[PDB]
Design a protein around this ligand. Structure first.
Ligand SMILES: *[C@@H]1O[C@H](CO)[C@@H](O[C@@H]2O[C@H](CO)[C@@H](O[C@@H]3O[C@H](CO[C@@H]4O[C@H](CO)[C@@H](O)[C@H](O)[C@@H]4O)[C@@H](O)[C@H](O[C@@H]4O[C@H](CO)[C@@H](O)[C@H](O)[C@@H]4O)[C@@H]3O)[C@H](O)[C@H]2NC(C)=O)[C@H](O)[C@H]1NC(C)=O
Ligand SMILES: [Ca+2]
Lengths: 640, 193, 179
């Protein structure tokens, strides 16, 4: 009757703090628990060994926090595993867990994006763990030429550096031009290699910027007006630009570019602005295909050369990747769970984007046949569509279309998905549904987690609590219990959102009982919640002086920097001309959270085909003493 | 499948426990408790159990007792082992079945089982090295009068563990391999493997 | 060093261990081994930690030649303890088989008597055959009485030893037949 269960992340990382939650449901008294982690399969060393007690005051639920040292015992190469062994009294529950070699994260920041032969590249390597907290480890750095050959190795230490490692590499005078790379990796994890590029080239600053901006972010193939483009030229110090611009158009097909010589135009740049139209006739005449439908799927690129009236500076700029499309939108189901609970409300996270991939704001979407279920995309281009599922085992097929008014039906975007029934233990029709209002969540608020139960009433009184777990950045952030009274179908969990939930977290909750043929049954459900991407703390740089005072060459200025107490701030001032030449590989905050999310162990928006699939797909391994456990995971990478 | 290894271990434990039931008071082994103890079977239990110490809990008294048994009883003064109670299953011995060079082959087999359990049974059994040396003496002396590829192979490995396989002996071990890659002899293929 | 196993007592008597040396141990009453039952000395220390789970004294006895004791050897023997010896096959034990521990010293241990060869070169040089039909074998345990006869055409000389000879600790008197 008593059931001991352990949950551990799908993949365990080295030198990272990992939590393990221990439960002894339907038990009395104190239960001594000793958790030991051994290597697989030899068990030569005891990587961890902690102890705890499950008391009735804690509802027989505890956790074990352990950090596995990066021992010299682990061996491309074969994948490594560990044996997790939890001992409750007499009973022992073991699970074989996959191990990732990633020690944490390395971020490289170069002062500039492009460099002249002879100059020095100043770069900082930030060394953190999976919690983004500064650590002191040994890092291997490789300088790599455009050809690919490493030309300078080094092994330094991050200790006593507050997670910031200042380095430099001198560029020889005689050097090969092109895209160079810096490759760093932790000493303990030579398989996790982080990279940043910087171009090496002979150049001079253009002293001004040219902006090629199309009216629309795309080109409708049946628009007789053609592609109207506005040219905006301005000096690097703000003032507008007077001059002449040579604009020419081209059609891009994959990697094959075909210039359109007939579309070449010379226009005056007056007051820093000019306009030039590519006529549809010239476009069709330029390509040797009368059938305009074939141009759909291809893109357009525009090249503009602006010359000042003084004739002392010239800037060429380009805007490529302008898709020739037949619809202003594009529907994706990459954020909607692919499993539903028959009879319970099914939530869809429609992701409507512009042809260039950017989110689309205020776009009407609806389900075919259900005009009542018509929602509007938010600022992130994500809309929520709640439907009512009928209790059935039929595959739920959904087709979502855009209902943007003032847009014809031929140009409306459409996409079709399918969801499968959540198979239950012994066809008992016991389902759990966690629902959350889909809206940009920010640190410092509170989210109401609605636990909704559906099962027969013959065993509904036995369910007295739910076990909920939170997954953030690939590690167990928080676990607890939710008391539920007999008769209540819906209970509300006030979950306090702090800074530890950035950028997103998964909430997987489950309940257990003894039902049907006296069988031990587990029913689970998970949901993915996004949070407003931002810094954990804050860092703002603003003017530390009067804004009547104008900056003058050489003049002292006061810089107001406001951030977290004790934090080490590293600075860099870059001329905007550099970014006019190359604006790639620039370190932003959005890119940091991007890397974190790509090292996530979850692979689905939510739920699964069974109670084990919910844990496995949400990056968790459940293993009970009675035998109910999740299947093994032998894949570091998610399934395609 | 990572999970299957646990059950695979359970079977080995089970087998070991089941084998303890046939351990005669002389620390030997036979098909039945009443049946006379077999030489080859006791030596084979040593073999398997010596290779299994790294997997499950093997008792030293059992393994080392069997070794001390084979030396004091089933060992002739020349030094060669004699099977005084042949095993009932003659198909579980492989190349020693109907073998004419039984003395040389059986010696090599038991000797190899001893050298695999040396590092484990060196403190309790004090007579082990001298017996290994005695077995080794007979194999060295009549190694060159071998004909069967199997006996040349098994006695070659019995002598290579000591480093006593040199000269004409090492030459015979290398030249008996036809096509330089297999020690083959007319008969069942399992014997050649 | 020699590990201190909790709820158990070591089997091996060695205190200092080099690399890869195995350390045998047994668990006390009410306990049994957990996974590995022995410990191996590696660079980082003992790989298998010796663990046990829930279910005037004399020294070691002196070794003898071509023999061994019947029980398993211990580091220390309580007073009035006694072990026995036994020789190899076709060997003969001579003396008191059992030794006793008295006042930190043992009693006198026995020895083992060597059997004899029935050499084929000696049989052909003396012109004698076994006369009890045989390919070989039937070898002279210390005290056994062998017999031979001459070949067809030879006779025992004037002072040739008897055809029925007894081996005594690796010494055998072969008969001789001349003419
Ligand atoms: C694993 O299991 C442990 C069990 O202890 C969990 O630790 C709980 O984590 C809470 C995080 O939400 C922590 O609560 C905090 O406690 C603050 C006090 O700081 C303590 O200082 C002592 C030093 O004597 C340390 O040992 C403690 O660890 C704490 O750091 C409080 O200011 C604050 O609030 C409290 O809890 C509730 C909140 O509603 C209040 O009502 C209450 O009055 C109290 O003020 C803060 O929330 C704390 O570390 C601990 N709390 C409890 C009750 O055990 C881990 O979080 C678990 N880890 C995982 C991954 O599940
Ligand atoms: Ca996010």
């Amino acid at each position: 009757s008593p059931m001991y269960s352990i949950i551990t992340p799908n993949i365990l990382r080295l030198e990272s703090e990992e939590t393990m939650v221990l439960e002894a449901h339907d038990a009395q008294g104190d239960v001594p628990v000793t958790v030991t982690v051994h290597d697989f399969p030899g068990k030569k060393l005891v990587l961890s060994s902690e102890k705890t007690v499950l008391t009735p005051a804690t509802n027989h639920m505890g956790n074990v926090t352990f950090t596995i040292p990066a021992n010299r015992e682990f061996k491309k190469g074969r994948n490594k595993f560990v044996t997790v062994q939890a001992t409750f009294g007499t009973q022992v529950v073991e699970k074989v867990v996959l191990v990732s070699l990633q020690s944490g994260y390395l971020f490289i920041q170069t002062d500039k994006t492009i460099y002249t032969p002879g100059s020095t590249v100043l770069y900082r390597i930030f060394t953190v763990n999976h919690k983004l907290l500064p650590v002191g480890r040994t890092v291997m750095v490789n300088i790599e030429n455009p050809e690919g050959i490493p030309v300078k190795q080094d092994s330094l230490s991050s200790q006593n550096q507050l997670g910031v490692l200042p380095l430099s590499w001198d560029i020889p005078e005689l050097v090969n031009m092109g895209q160079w790379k810096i490759r760093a990796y932790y000493e303990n994890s030579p398989q996790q290699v982080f990279s940043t590029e910087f171009e090496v080239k002979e150049y001079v600053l253009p002293s001004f910027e040219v902006i090629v901006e199309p009216t629309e972010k795309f080109y409708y193939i049946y628009n007789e007006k053609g592609l109207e483009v506005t040219i905006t030229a301005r000096f690097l110090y703000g003032k507008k630009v007077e001059g002449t611009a040579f604009v020419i158009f081209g059609i891009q097909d994959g990697e094959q570019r075909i210039s359109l010589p007939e579309s070449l135009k010379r226009i005056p740049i007056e007051d820093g602005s000019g306009e030039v139209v590519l006529s549809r006739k010239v476009l069709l005449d330029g390509v040797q295909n009368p059938r305009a439908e074939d141009l759909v799927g291809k893109s357009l690129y525009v090249s503009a050369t602006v010359i000042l009236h003084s004739g002392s500076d010239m800037v060429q700029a380009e805007r490529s990747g302008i898709p020739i499309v037949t619809s202003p939108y594009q529907i994706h189901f990459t954020k909607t769970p692919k499993y539903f609970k028959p009879g319970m409300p099914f939530d869809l996270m429609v992701f409507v984007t512009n042809p260039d991939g950017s989110p689309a704001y205020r776009v009407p979407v609806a389900v075919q046949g259900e005009d009542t279920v018509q929602s509007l995309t938010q600022g992130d281009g994500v809309a929520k569509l709640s439907i009512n599922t009928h209790p059935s085992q039929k595959p739920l097929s959904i087709t979502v279309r855009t209902k943007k008014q003032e847009l014809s039906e031929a140009e409306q975007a459409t996409r079709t998905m399918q969801a499968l029934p959540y198979s239950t233990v012994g066809n008992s029709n016991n389902y759990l549904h966690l629902s959350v209002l889909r809206t940009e969540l920010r640190p410092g608020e509170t989210l109401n987690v609605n636990f909704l139960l559906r099962m027969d009433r013959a065993h509904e009184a036995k369910i007295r609590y739910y076990t909920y777990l939170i997954m953030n950045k690939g590690r167990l952030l928080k676990a607890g219990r939710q008391v539920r009274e007999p008769g209540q179908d819906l209970v509300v969990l006030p979950l306090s959102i702090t800074t530890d939930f950035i950028p997103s977290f998964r909430l997987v909750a489950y309940y257990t009982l003894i039902g049907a043929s006296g069988q031990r049954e587990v029913v689970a459900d998970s949901v993915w919640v996004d949070v407003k991407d931002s810094c954990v703390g804050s860092l703002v740089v603003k003017s530390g002086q009067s804004e009547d005072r104008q900056p003058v060459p050489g003049q002292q200025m006061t810089l107001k920097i406001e951030g977290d107490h004790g934090a080490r701030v590293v600075l860099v001032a870059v001329d905007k001309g550099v970014f006019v030449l190359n604006k790639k590989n620039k370190l932003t905050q959005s890119k940091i959270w991007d890397v974190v999310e790509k090292a996530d162990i979850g692979c689905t928006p939510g739920s699964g085909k069974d109670y084990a699939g919910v844990f496995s797909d949400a990056g968790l391994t459940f293993t009970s003493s009675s035998g109910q456990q999740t299947a093994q995971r032998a894949e570091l990478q998610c399934p395609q | 499948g990572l999970e299957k290894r646990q059950g695979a271990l359970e079977l080995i434990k089970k087998g070991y426990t089941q084998q303890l039931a046939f351990r005669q008071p002389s620390s030997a082994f036979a098909a039945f408790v009443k049946r006379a103890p077999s030489t080859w079977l006791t030596a084979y239990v040593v073999k398997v159990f010596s290779l299994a110490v790294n997997l499950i809990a093997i008792d030293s008294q059992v393994l080392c007792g069997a070794v001390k048994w084979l030396i004091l009883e089933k060992q002739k003064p020349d030094g060669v082992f004699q099977e005084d109670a042949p095993v009932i299953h003659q198909e579980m011995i492989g190349g020693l079945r109907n073998n004419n060079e039984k003395d040389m082959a059986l010696t090599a087999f038991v000797l190899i089982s001893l050298q695999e359990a040396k590092d484990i049974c060196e403190e309790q059994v004090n007579s082990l090295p001298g017996s290994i040396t005695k077995a080794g003496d007979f194999l060295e002396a009549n190694y060159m009068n071998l004909q069967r590829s199997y006996t040349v192979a098994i006695a070659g490995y019995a002598l290579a563990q000591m480093g006593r396989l040199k000269g004409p002996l090492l030459n015979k071990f290398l030249t008996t391999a036809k096509d330089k890659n297999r020690w083959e002899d007319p008969g069942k293929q399992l014997y050649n493997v | 060093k020699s590990p201190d196993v909790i709820n158990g007592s070591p089997i091996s008597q060695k205190i200092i261990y080099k690399e890869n040396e195995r350390f045998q141990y047994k668990c006390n009453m009410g306990y049994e081994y957990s996974e590995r039952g022995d410990a191996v000395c590696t660079e980082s220390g003992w790989r298998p930690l010796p663990s046990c789970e829930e279910k005037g004294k004399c020294g070691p006895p002196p070794p003898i030649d071509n023999g061994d004791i019947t029980s398993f050897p211990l580091s220390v023997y309580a007073p009035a303890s006694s072990v026995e010896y036994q020789c190899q096959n076709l060997y003969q034990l001579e003396g008191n088989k059992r030794i006793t521990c008295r006042n930190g010293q043992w009693s006198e241990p026995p020895k083992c008597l060597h059997p004899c060869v029935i050499s084929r070169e000696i049989m052909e040089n003396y012109n004698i055959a076994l006369r009890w039909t045989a390919k070989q074998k039937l070898y002279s345990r210390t005290g056994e009485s062998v017999e031979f006869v001459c070949k067809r055409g030879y006779r025992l000389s004037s002072r040739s030893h008897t055809l029925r000879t007894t081996c005594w600790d690796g010494k055998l008197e072969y008969p001789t037949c001349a003419k």
